[PDB]
């Protein structure tokens, strides 16, 4: 009824990085409710959308989207590593992202 969410909420946190050097080509994603690499494995290989709004209509809409996917896990706390079609703008650290259930395996 009031709920139509077919995705899972996540947070783009930061890039893959060392102490003093970051790699924008890989982003770190915190999936909501996932606290272990064991659930990160289920979330592996899954499409991600970063959806944002622009003041200018481009192709019949004022909403633009960047596509990527959870590829592999990162650490021991359920953080995953995602690669997007275009690297995220880095102003979207700690920003809402959607992880879709497709390509589904269950």
């Amino acid at each position: 009824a009031e709920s139509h969410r077919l995705y899972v909420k996540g947070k783009h946190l930061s890039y893959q990085r060392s102490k003093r050097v970051n790699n924008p080509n890989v982003s770190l994603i915190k999936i909501e409710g996932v606290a272990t690499p064991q659930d990160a494995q289920f979330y592996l290989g899954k499409r991600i959308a970063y959806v944002y709004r622009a003041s200018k209509e481009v192709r019949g809409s004022k909403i633009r989207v960047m596509w990527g996917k959870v590829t592999r896990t990162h650490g021991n706390s359920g953080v995953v590593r995602a690669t997007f079609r275009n690297n995220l703008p880095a102003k979207t650290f700690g920003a809402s992202v959607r992880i879709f259930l497709y390509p589904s395996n269950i």
Binding site: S3, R5, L6, Y7, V8, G33, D39, F42, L101, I106
Partner: peptide, 15 residues
């Protein structure tokens, strides 16, 4: 129609 609600974790959720 199916929808995901607050607290639904598909990894822990059995379909």
């Amino acid at each position: 129609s199916f929808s995901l609600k607050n607290g639904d974790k598909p990894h822990l959720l059995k379909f």
